[PDB]
């Protein structure tokens, strides 16, 4: 289940995104709620620090902006 993909405390954000999208590929869900899972569920399940940074970026942030912003974690 996609709701079980949570970024580990040491896990790099790129690997977490990879697992999140891999499990995202099998999820049985409409394309709008999959867009909500990419935009919002990904942020909610990140580890604490990278979650703080990702929330700080506000709305509309791309996956590349999100990956650059968390590279200091």
């Amino acid at each position: 289940s996609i709701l079980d993909i949570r970024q580990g405390p040491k896990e790099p954000f790129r690997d977490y995104v990879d697992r999140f999208y891999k499990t995202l590929r099998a999820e049985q869900a409409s394309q709008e709620v999959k867009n909500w899972m990419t935009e919002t569920l990904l942020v909610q399940n990140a580890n604490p620090d990278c979650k703080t940074i990702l929330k700080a970026l506000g709305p509309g942030a791309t996956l590349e902006e999100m990956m650059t912003a968390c590279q200091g974690v």
Partner: nanobody
Amino acid sequence: DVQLQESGGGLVQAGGSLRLSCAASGSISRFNAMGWWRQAPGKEREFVARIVKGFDPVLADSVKGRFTISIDSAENTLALQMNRLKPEDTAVYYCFAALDTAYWGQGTQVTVSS
């Protein structure tokens, strides 16, 4: 460790201009992202501007025509220049910086009034 302090806030007339500045400890090129949020009484934190390292600045739709976000590496400061200010712009403004976590200043008050 990471220190941020906003400044440049005050009281201005409608249609005026103001320049907020966020002082950071160390060099600003070390941060992977910085930006600006604002909060008005009773309203939840609103996103204003963001700059992520290597990327173009993104600004909110309510500010896009009037505000600019910049980085001054000489003064180690993050600037938000606000122009054509409106009463809706009255709020406390916070800068944030992204390193190992997100760090925030405590904010500066910006007041637009007649």
